[PDB]
Amino acid sequence: PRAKFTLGCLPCLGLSLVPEIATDFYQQNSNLVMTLTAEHTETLVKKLDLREIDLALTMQPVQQGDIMATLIAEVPLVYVDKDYRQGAVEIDSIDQQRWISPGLDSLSTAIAAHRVFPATGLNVETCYMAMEFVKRGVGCCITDIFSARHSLTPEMIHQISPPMKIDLYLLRRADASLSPVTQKFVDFLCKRLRNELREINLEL
Amino acid sequence: AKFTLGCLPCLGLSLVPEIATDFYQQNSNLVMTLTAEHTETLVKKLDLREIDLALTMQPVQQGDIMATLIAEVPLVYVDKDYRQGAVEIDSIDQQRWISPGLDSLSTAIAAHRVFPATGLNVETCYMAMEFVKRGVGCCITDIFSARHSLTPEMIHQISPPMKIDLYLLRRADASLSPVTQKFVDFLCKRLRNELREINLEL
Ligand SMILES: O=C(O)C(=O)Cc1c[nH]c2ccccc12
Ligand SMILES: O=C(O)C(=O)Cc1c[nH]c2ccccc12
Ligand SMILES: [Mg+2]
């Protein structure tokens, strides 16, 4: 029974993870009207208010209007740099003269819990844009594991000490209801996201 | 000099960071902020002076926005199935079409062929490219999102060649510093020179 739903997600989730999961679902159920888009948190919330999307994946809880925030799992953060010293990295050991300031508030807030970095020359509000600067040796960053895995060779990806994490949320309007097929997708999405993150977290 | 440049996702995957890198190695006297957004959002943030510059594939003259035509971006057909070689728009399997939503890319495609409603709609370039990589469907996309995400045998020229225009947007009532305008000139030159070289390869 053909159901129509729109999923919006953060850019770091749209690079590979969400397309992979949507693919696995699309193959075992083709009669669908599936719309996917990647947006920043603020846009995701407004498009949810305006019923332009039905589901949003963020790293921030929200309780405005009728939006229900469901905690799916915890996303590990990693230090990324074009340097060939391997092993974990303490946040206090990071060279602040090469720091690229992130734009993800949750990422920033989590980093600010352990260290506040001063104003710098490069500020990058989109994960894959920051990763390209790291790839070219321009600077270093702390990012989610997904944007690091997708864009960087493993020699550039380092665990942080102490471990750092941020929460992954599925946002959904309460009063806007979903079809039976759509709720099946939501369950599948949440289980897959939790299982993948369960593994990744154990690897770190 | 502090300025914020917004750009489309396909331009942020590698092109704009490369050019910003080459500029920021030769000029450290600057506070550069970079973000990737959809056209709609880029325009609003430009209206509200939240960003100073936007790279789009669409002219805009609403409000105070001035559009500068930089270059033409070649469009390509992407599909892991279709064997290597150029592809006519009429020969496209519309059963496996991934709709790019509603933007300038779609309008440009609609000028030559209208594709019916389909099961997969993907409003973000790199998300569509991942579906192509997994064999799920095919698309027409800009060369940058195809080069960055796909191996070359998945990237096909279109017949007849299709292109879409690249624009730098700027508010008219927005004065920018000397260093910032130097970056703008460098950015426009590099974007044209790179596109000139890509277009000759196609
Ligand atoms: O805006 C994006 O691309 C995001 O998904 C948030 C984000 C995740 N990791 C980052 C690293 C640097 C800047 C933004 C992000
Ligand atoms: O850069 C983006 O993500 C855009 O909005 C434009 C776009 C370029 N190539 C595409 C392929 C599928 C959907 C949108 C685009
Ligand atoms: Mg994006």
Domains A3-73+167-202 and A75-165 share a fold: yes
Say how far residue B122 (Cα) sits from the centre of its chain: 15
User: Would you identify the CATH topology of the domain B72-163?
Assistant: D-Maltodextrin-Binding Protein; domain 2 (3.40.190)
Closest CA relative to residue B132, chosen from B72, B88, B76 = B76
Say how far residue A84 (Cα) sits from the centre of its chain: 26
Residue A70, phi then psi, degrees to nearest 5: -110, 120
Residue A174, phi then psi, degrees to nearest 5: -70, -60
Say how far residue B107 (Cα) sits from the centre of its chain: 14
Site to probe by mutation for ligand 2, drawn from B145, B149, B154, B166 as the one with most ligand atoms within 8 Å of Cβ, is B145
Which residues are CB-contacts of B53 (< 8 A; sequence separation ≥ 6)? B3, B4, B5, B6, B168, B169, B170, B184
Residue B79, phi then psi, degrees to nearest 5: -170, 130
CATH number for the domain running over B2-71+166-200: 3.40.190.10
Q: Using CA atoms, how far apart are residues B87 and B167, in angstroms rounded to an integer? A: 27
Answer whether B124 sits within 8 Å of A37, measured CB to CB: yes
Burial (CB count <10 Å: 0-12, 13-18, 19+), residue B59: middle
Question: Which of A28, A44, A122 to mutate to test binding with chain B, by most B CBs within 10 Å of its CB?
Answer: A122
Distances (CA, A) of B60 to A193, B6, B69: 39, 15, 11
B196 min Cα distance to partner chain A (Å): 23
* Residue A37, both tokens: 């888009």
The protein residue whose alpha carbon is closest to atom 11 in ligand 2 is: B125
Closest CA relative to residue A166, chosen from A196, A186, A142 = A142
Torsion angle, CA of B103/A27/A54/A146, rounded to 10 degrees?
-80
Q: Which helix (H) or strand (E) holds B77?
A: strand B65-78
DSSP state of B13: T
**Residue pair B1/B178 in contact by the 8 Å Cβ criterion:** yes
Half-sphere exposure of A185 (CA within 13 A, CB side): 31
Q: Using CA atoms, how far apart are residues B171 and B66, in angstroms rounded to an integer? A: 6
Report how many helices (DSSP H) and strands (DSSP E) chain B contains, helices first. 7, 10
Q: Using CA atoms, how far apart are residues A182 and A1, in angstroms rounded to an integer? A: 10
Burial (CB count <10 Å: 0-12, 13-18, 19+), residue A203: exposed
Selected from 3.40.50.720, 3.40.50.300, 3.40.190.10, 3.90.650.10, the CATH number assigned to the domain covering A75-165 reads: 3.40.190.10
Structural domain boundaries in chain A: 3-73+167-202, 75-165
Q: Using CA atoms, how far apart are residues B95 and A163, in angstroms rounded to an integer? A: 47
- DSSP per position, chain A: --EEEEEEE-HHHHTTHHHHHHHHHHHT--SEEEEEEE--HHHHHHHHHTTS-SEEEESS---STTEEEEEEEEEEEEEE-S----S-EEGGGS-GGGB-B---HHHHHHHHHH-PPPP-SEEESSHHHHHHHHHTTS-BEEEEHHHHHHHS-GGGEEEEES--EEEEEEEEESSS---HHHHHHHHHHHHHHHHHHHHHHHT-
Q: Using CA atoms, how far apart are residues A190 and B169, in angstroms rounded to an integer? A: 39
β A3-9/A55-58 pair status: parallel
B27-52 burial, b at 16+ Cβ within 10 Å, e below that, comes to eeebbbbbbbbbbebbbebbeeeebb
Asked if B176 reaches chain A (Cβ–Cβ under 8 Å), the answer is no
Half-sphere exposure of B16 (CA within 13 A, CB side): 28
* Residue A163, both tokens: 């471990």
The protein residue whose alpha carbon is closest to atom 15 in ligand 2 is: B125
Burial (CB count <10 Å: 0-12, 13-18, 19+), residue A28: exposed
Q: Using CA atoms, how far apart are residues B121 and A48, in angstroms rounded to an integer? A: 17
Q: Is the CB of A150 under 6 A from ligand 1?
A: no
Answer whether B134 sits within 8 Å of A38, measured CB to CB: no
Give chain B positions within 8 Å (CB) of A43.
Answer: 37-38, 41
* Residue B119, both tokens: 């099961």
Ligand having the closest approach to the CA of A110: 1
Q: Using CA atoms, how far apart are residues B109 and B114, in angstroms rounded to an integer? A: 7
Asked if A184 reaches chain B (Cβ–Cβ under 8 Å), the answer is no
Which residues are CB-contacts of B132 (< 8 A; sequence separation ≥ 6)? B78, B79, B80, B98, B138, B139, B149, B150, B154
Chain A residue closest in CA terms to B120: A34
Half-sphere exposure of B185 (CA within 13 A, CB side): 7
**Method of determination?**
X-ray
Instruction: Name B140's bridge partners.
Output: B77
The protein residue whose alpha carbon is closest to atom 12 in ligand 2 is: B125
Chain A residue closest in CA terms to B45: A43
Answer whether B119 sits within 8 Å of A31, measured CB to CB: yes
Closest CA relative to residue A11, chosen from A43, A48, A49 = A43
Answer whether B17 sits within 8 Å of A121, measured CB to CB: no
Chain B residue closest in CA terms to A3: B119
Torsion angle, CA of A27/A28/A34/A40, rounded to 10 degrees?
-80
Residue A147: CB atoms within 10 A of its CB come to 26
Question: Which of A2, A21, A36, A185 to mutate to test binding with chain B, by most B CBs within 10 Å of its CB?
Answer: A36
For residue B141, report the distance from its CA to the centre of ligand 3, in Å: 15
Instruction: Name A165's bridge partners.
Output: A76
Q: Using CA atoms, how far apart are residues A107 and B187, in angstroms rounded to an integer? A: 29
Which residues are CB-contacts of B134 (< 8 A; sequence separation ≥ 6)? A19, A20, A23, B80
Say how far residue A132 (Cα) sits from the centre of its chain: 17
Q: Relative to the CA of B36, which ligand 2 atom is closest? A: 1
Class of CATH domain A3-73+167-202: alpha beta
Closest CA relative to residue A116, chosen from A151, A84, A142 = A142
Answer whether B12 sits within 8 Å of A123, measured CB to CB: no
For residue A170, report the distance from its CA to the centre of ligand 1, in Å: 17
**Residue pair A9/A40 in contact by the 8 Å Cβ criterion:** no
* Residue A58, both tokens: 């963020």
- Matching residue, tokens 């925030």: A69
Residue B38, phi then psi, degrees to nearest 5: -75, 160
